[PDB]
Design a protein around this ligand. Structure first.
Ligand code: LI5
Length: 237
């Protein structure tokens, strides 16, 4: 005490409260291991037209009532169109005011953003050290078709620096993805995992991957979340 602290970044169409509810199992284990888990809300307030999937008026009202019409950034299928400035500043401001944080945990948009923040934390928040641990749940990077490599993807130029990982990072990366996930197919999370693995010269003790059988969700099954939490707590020691 003060005990280690992790910052949790939710996914598209959630908020801090809902993410806390969805991550209750992992949070229970971390709290038992004397780790503090902080949840914050994404700043981009969505209108119905900003949804990339169908939803009726009733379900949209329900979304409004729950205060979950939120994103870290507007969705686009075209990576060069993405703008993370507001969401990034929101998290950075929070860390400035409430840090330092020993680690970070992100889901889907929150995981794309948490990965970028992991890469850049010491530049974004002067005097803040590297994270000890970064947990990337159903994450992805801002890829596009590679013109000279049909069928292959590259990171869009706007975000090349953002997803660049320096060699010899102290941070332990923990990737989590669901085998059934169709919102963010695991190929995207593995693509991002590979960037870290390469930067760490193939060291699977520093860059870890856990696949669960489920879909686009924070996993809760004992046999998956226990080893994950063990890896987090061991990095914090
Ligand atoms: P992530 O969940 O933040 O990004 C993936 C999609 O844009 C969001 C999504 O499929 C949903 O929010 C589904 C409910």
């Amino acid at each position: 005490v003060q005990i280690p602290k992790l910052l949790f970044l939710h996914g598209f169409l959630q908020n801090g409260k809902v993410f806390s509810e969805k991550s209750s199992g992992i949070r229970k284990l971390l709290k038992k291991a004397n780790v503090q888990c902080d949840y914050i809300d994404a700043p981009v307030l969505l209108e119905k037209k900003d949804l990339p999937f169908e939803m009726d008026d009733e379900k949209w009202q329900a979304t409004l009532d729950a205060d979950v019409n939120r994103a870290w950034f507007y969705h686009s299928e075209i990576s060069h169109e993405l703008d993370i400035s507001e969401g990034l500043k929101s998290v950075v401001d929070h860390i400035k005011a409430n840090g330092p944080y020993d680690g970070i945990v992100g889901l889907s948009q929150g995981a794309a953003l948490s990965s970028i923040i992991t890469n850049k934390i010491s530049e974004l928040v002067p005097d803040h050290p590297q994270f000890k641990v970064s947990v990337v749940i159903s994450g992805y990077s801002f890829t596009e078709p590679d013109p000279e490599h049909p069928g292959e993807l590259r990171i869009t130029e706007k975000f090349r620096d953002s997803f660049a990982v320096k060699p010899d990072m102290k941070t332990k990366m923990i990737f989590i993805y669901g085998a059934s996930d169709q919102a963010v197919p695991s190929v995207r999370s593995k693509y991002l995992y590979d960037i870290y693995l390469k930067a760490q010269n193939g060291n699977k003790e520093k860059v870890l991957a856990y696949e669960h059988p489920g879909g686009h969700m924070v996993p809760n099954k004992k046999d998956i979340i226990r080893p994950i939490v063990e890896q987090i707590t061991s990095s914090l020691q």
